[PDB]
Design a binder for these strands. Sequence first.
RNA 1: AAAUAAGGGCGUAUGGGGAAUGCCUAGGCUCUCAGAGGCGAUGAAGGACGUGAUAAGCUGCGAAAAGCUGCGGGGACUGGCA
RNA 2: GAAAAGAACCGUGAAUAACGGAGUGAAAUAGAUCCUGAAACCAUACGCUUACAAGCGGUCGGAGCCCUUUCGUGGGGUGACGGCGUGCCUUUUGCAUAAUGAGCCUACGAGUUAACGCUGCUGGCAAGGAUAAGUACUUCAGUACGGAUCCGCAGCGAAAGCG
RNA 3: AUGGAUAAUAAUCGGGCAUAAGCAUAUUACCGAAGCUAUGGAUUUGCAAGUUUGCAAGUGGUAGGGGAGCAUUCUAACAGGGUUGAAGGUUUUUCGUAAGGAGGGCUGGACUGGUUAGAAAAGAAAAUGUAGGCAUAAGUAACGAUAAUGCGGGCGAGAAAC
Lengths: 150, 128, 150, 113, 64, 154
Amino acid sequence: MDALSYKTISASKATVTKEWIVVDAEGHNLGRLASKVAMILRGKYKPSYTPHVDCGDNVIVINSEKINLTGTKLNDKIYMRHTGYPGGQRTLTAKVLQSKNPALLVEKAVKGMLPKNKLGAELFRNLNVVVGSEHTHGAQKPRTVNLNDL
Amino acid sequence: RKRETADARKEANKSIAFAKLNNCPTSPRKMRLVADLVRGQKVERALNILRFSSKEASRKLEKLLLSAINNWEQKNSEGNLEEAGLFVKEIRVDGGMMLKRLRPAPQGRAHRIRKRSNHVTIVLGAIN
Amino acid sequence: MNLSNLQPAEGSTHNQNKRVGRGEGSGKGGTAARGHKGAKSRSGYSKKIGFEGGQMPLQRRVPKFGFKNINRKEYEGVNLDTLQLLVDNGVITDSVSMTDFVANRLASKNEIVKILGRGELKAKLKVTAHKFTATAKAAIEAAGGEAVTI
Amino acid sequence: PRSVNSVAKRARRKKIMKQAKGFFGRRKNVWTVAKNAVEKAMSYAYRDRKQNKRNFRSLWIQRINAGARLEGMSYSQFMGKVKANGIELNRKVLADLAMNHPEAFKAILNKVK
Amino acid sequence: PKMKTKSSAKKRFKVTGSGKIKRKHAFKSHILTKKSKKRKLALTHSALVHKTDEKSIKQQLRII
Amino acid sequence: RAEVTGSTRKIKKQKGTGTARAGSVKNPLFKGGGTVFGPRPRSYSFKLNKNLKRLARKSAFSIKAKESNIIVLEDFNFEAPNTKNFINVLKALGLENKKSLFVLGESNKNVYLSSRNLKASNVVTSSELSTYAILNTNNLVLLEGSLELIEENL
RNA sequence: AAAUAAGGGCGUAUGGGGAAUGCCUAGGCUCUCAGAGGCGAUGAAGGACGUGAUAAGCUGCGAAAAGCUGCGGGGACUGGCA
RNA sequence: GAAAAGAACCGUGAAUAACGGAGUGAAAUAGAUCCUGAAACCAUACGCUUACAAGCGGUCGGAGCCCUUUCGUGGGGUGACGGCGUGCCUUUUGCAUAAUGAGCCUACGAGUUAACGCUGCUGGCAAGGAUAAGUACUUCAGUACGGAUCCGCAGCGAAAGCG
RNA sequence: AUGGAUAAUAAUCGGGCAUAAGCAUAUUACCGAAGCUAUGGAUUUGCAAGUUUGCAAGUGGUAGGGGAGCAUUCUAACAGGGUUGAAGGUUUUUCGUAAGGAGGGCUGGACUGGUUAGAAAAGAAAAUGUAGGCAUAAGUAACGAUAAUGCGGGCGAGAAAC
């Protein structure tokens, strides 16, 4: 009979407000930036976060070509890409992978810190990883956010 | 409740025109194939489809529709038939009482064979 | 009061609904009351009384002893205490014969009575019995009349 | 006399099957499949009631953390300074304030900070 | 019908005055020349059925 | 299982059939088998001490005496059996539409026949009284002559 | 005429299917009281074949064949199930 | 079906296959598969969802959309999305186990009775307690009488015996 | 910390990944269970008042032991209901710790049942259990010697088979 009389209001799709955050990845470590990017994408810096709603902002990383790894990880980081056929386990390297589409580094770093669900596959579509220094969104008026102010 | 009152209230079939085909020695799964092509069509397109269908389940279904048309003409005596523009509102193919026979399988055993029947019901409705 | 208000004493009636093997929830269900498998859980099990598992029972490890006399004469046994308690509540006066023993349910019709000497008989009586004891005769002949053997 | 429990035998299972309304497949009409599904549903309903009380506290804590990190603070420090100040407001009310009344939330934060 | 009394138990196991069962001792049959006179004197007096066997002896004697 | 009209023959083989093992068609879990643990011809009479029985019969009289449902007549006699006359003498006592038990001291066949047809009146001699008979009625009518036998028998 | 996601899931309503349940009895079960405890060479029990204005079965009856005679009861319908 | 009053007659149809009418009845959705007639099972209409999304199919949260409304921190239906979650029985130290068993529904189906005893509660009488077979009367498978006999009141000893 | 070979379906700190988000010591705040506490309610023993209340200790549970009860069929008494609609079937509301009770709408067209006491053919989800009905496999296997059929007329509503 709805005997609660005091409920916790959860945000809906008609009440959320998505922003267009732009993040500069010039001086930043891969995982150290990807953690904050994934937290912003999921949406947890708003005091209205509902776990089942696609809250949060849309992140545009604008310097992914200028990211760096700490140790000899650029030469000793391996990515496994098994295909499904017998003997089809392919291994890449962090140095070879950034030679073609360097945005894949940040893309695969962010994909993995997400809830791994339908909500979490729909959150990956809000992340735009640009290899250059200028995006192609244009008439959206995105604001720059420094990850050191969170 | 008074059963005569309930029956007099339920006897509202003086307007709806329908037709039934009971105890047809054909399986329902094979007539439900031709009922889907007729369901919702016009009263003449349905007749053409049933007359040119390559199924033995249509030879006795094409005249049930004619009987339904005749029942509609009987109920709506005052008025012609082509101005109304009849169609096939609803058509349902139900099951029926099946006969059970035996077939001698190899090595001294017997299998069962069920000769199935089906009931067909059709209502016309009008566009006007 | 009436045939529609019959009520027995509190505690004379009981459950009468207790049946064994009527589902889990009434107690005895499933393996009804016999635990798990074994000879004591099979239909038709009966405990062999003398059986001791396979070894020699006590009713067979102990020797037999004694015999039975065919001419055993067993007397009834009446005490001076009972005689005095019977003479206090006046039913017998100055003569206790073999008839006052049957009229007071002390001996059967055709039996033999022996007067024992457990009591403190004080009244003067003239008893007629089959046998006497060294205490009963000495306590009767000294504290009252005679004691004749019949 | 011969006693047959024919009517109540089925009246008892109708009531247990009427709560398996909306189940996929034969779990809603077949008796020996519905009874096996209603009991497991009640077993699942007994629990998740202890979990509804700790899944909402997590949401309250997350919302309080989000509302407190907007003022350059953290949930741990905020809760420490609130508990060692004589306030005694539960996380439900604190999250409701952080979500609906940001002015009241920041007033509480400035008072305890 | 009526419970029958076991003869093997009725020939032994004389019941005492109030609640006990009196029986005899064993081992005093045919090898008495090498046993000490102390054992033969102890095994001569009648004994009582132990409380662990009393239930079985009473079930045999038909005193449940 | 033993009285069923059938035959004690194994239906199917023990093994190699694929179905449940069975035989002796008269078994209870088959259609037409014997009723296991069914009813039997019995006797439901138990023993009560004739002291407790007369104590109960005395309590049944004391209950009516306390409830004030005891009348005493003068041992009337009817020439011919007449239900009309027997009903005529029920309003002088006030037992109309009430359950009455007339306890006679003697046969009085005419008085018994004059009430054999009524359901609200029962004529019973003192040599056949019972606790149930006393408790069933709503008003006892002890004729003068039956009390001498009721009192000196308990 | 309308609708249309090729199809599926859930809820409601209306149908076919089936025979459960409820009610009833034509039939059975255990007995009480009082009798009786056999039929057959004057041809038994059990059958076969026949018998009708009309006659496939059941019932009855035997070439005198759904029947014959005598003594009593009975008083308007009858030619068995039909 | 109370009683055949068991559907004369008309139309579609090749058709005395079936149906729609018309008459009988209180009822024909009581039409001879005939009283009421459920479940498994097979279909149609309507409302909500579903073609980038992996698992005992439920449970706890949760928008949106349809009906109702004492008007509601009321009810009903469907539910996009999130968290948790490897059916049941039996046998086992231990089973999601790839150990057993069941295609589903309806009906049947397994600690009952007699005789002789023992414990717990209750009742009558009380150093006494109780009748059995049977008999008499009667309004008859249902008050009186019947003390034969059984248990207890004294035990010990193999027994005579003593008490 | 470093070198001291490794196993056969693609692998591992659980994964992303981390140069600290590793390790060693010390401190503070916080998270964290059906543990403890706060609120409401129910129940078992022991102690008192009475004729339910108060306090204390409890309240996981297999084999197993004990105590209170529900439904079903029938019977004995008192009191009832029903063609102005009984039992039964289908939905809905409400009450109880539960077994279950009561009320309303629809079908149904004759029985039913309260209180106290009694009796038992007194409750199924499994026994490769029994009988009847109905699904799945599925419109799938098969339509029973590879000696063979084609055309034109006839009856007929309808012909590859007459």
